[PDB]
Design a protein. Structure first.
Length: 251
């Protein structure tokens, strides 16, 4: 689906994931002591943690299994938690392939099932990349099963420019629209935020097309985007970012 070349920026993140899974997977011999299977991606939501996990899977040519912590939470649903790991081990043996269980919203597993999960982790020493928008909520005992913890931050200028270039590639822009200006004006927003902003501008012009019974939409202008930015605000708070920075600092 995707790989490191498709990902713009995030140097440090790529490096970390090279240390945690990619290198150890290509050359297990250079890691004789045995090396973590727990990986924790954390940061503000709509920042591409899933994309990152899938890319990692792609680079080591792994099996990818996505899991939502809110699906298995709904008790006897406890057994399925082991269902997944089982399937993973078995498939791994089967195809001569590493396996990756990706869990979104890991903090959701936090009363009985959580215990089995942690077991299944301990049975690891197949990788588990968990992802959380709320890492605090994770208690120390849980956080001990993930030794490698990676902070995926808000998109920077280069990335936001990449996102605008992607999302607008297929729609008509005014010849005066600078993708660079959009990137600057979007400091603080998320990847999802950018997607939604572009979708908004597009809808706006489509609504006009239908209303004025034109068979075509007018070019999206810079003012359209500015109006939208006046109304819509970062879906993540400046203080939440700090809350990430002090937790990462916390360890
Ligand atoms: Cl994210």
């Amino acid at each position: 689906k995707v790989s490191f070349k498709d990902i713009v920026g995030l140097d440090d993140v790529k490096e970390a994931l090279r240390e945690a899974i990619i290198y150890p997977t290509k050359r297990p011999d250079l890691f004789p002591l045995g090396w973590p299977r727990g990986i924790l991606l954390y940061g503000p939501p709509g920042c591409g943690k899933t994309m990152i996990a899938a890319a990692v899977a792609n680079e080591i040519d792994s099996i990818f299994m996505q899991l939502d912590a809110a699906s298995v939470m709904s008790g006897e649903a406890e057994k399925n938690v082991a269902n997944v790991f089982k399937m993973a081990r078995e498939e791994s043996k089967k195809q001569n392939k590493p396996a990756i269980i990706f869990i979104d919203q890991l903090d959701a597993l936090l009363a009985r099932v959580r215990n089995q999960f942690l077991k299944e982790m301990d049975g690891l020493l197949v990788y588990v990349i968990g992802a959380t928008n709320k890492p605090w909520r994770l208690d120390e005992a849980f956080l001990r099963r993930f030794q490698k913890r990676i902070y995926v931050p808000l998109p920077d200028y280069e990335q936001r420019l990449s996102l605008f270039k992607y999302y607008t590639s297929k729609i008509k822009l005014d010849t005066e629209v600078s993708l660079e200006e959009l990137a600057k004006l979007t400091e603080g927003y998320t990847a999802s935020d950018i997607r939604d902003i572009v979708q908004a501008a597009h809808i706006k012009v489509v609504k006009e097309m239908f209303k004025n019974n034109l068979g075509e939409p007018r070019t999206i202008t810079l003012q359209d985007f500015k109006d939208i930015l006046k109304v819509r605000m970062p879906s993540v708070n400046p203080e939440l970012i700090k809350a990430y920075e002090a937790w990462t600092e916390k360890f």
